[PDB]
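assembly run, all chains below
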Amino acid sequence: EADNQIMGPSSYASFVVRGENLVTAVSYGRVMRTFEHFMARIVDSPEKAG
Amino acid sequence: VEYAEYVGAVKTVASALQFGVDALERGLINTVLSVKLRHAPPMFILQTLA
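ok done. output:
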């Protein structure tokens, strides 16, 4: 083998229902992943397309 | 999301205990009113007896 070991992650990339998704979990029952990135895309400058 | 359910679970038991102690100050007044209503001979007897 060219290499004997690979460089991988050490822990699970966690995801918790934080303060913005708790309101829609308790209120609607629809959580999204990375609510802060939806807010960064359509609230804070929606004119900047990714 | 489990602390947000534990909050509702302490609200339920608190509003059941407060229901049970509201229904006893509502039952004490009912007992007082229904024991005033048993030692109350009517007007057409006490207007002559007194």
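Helices of chain A lie at 19-27, 35-42.

Chain A touches chain B through four residues (CB under 8 Å).

not gonna interpret more than that til we talk
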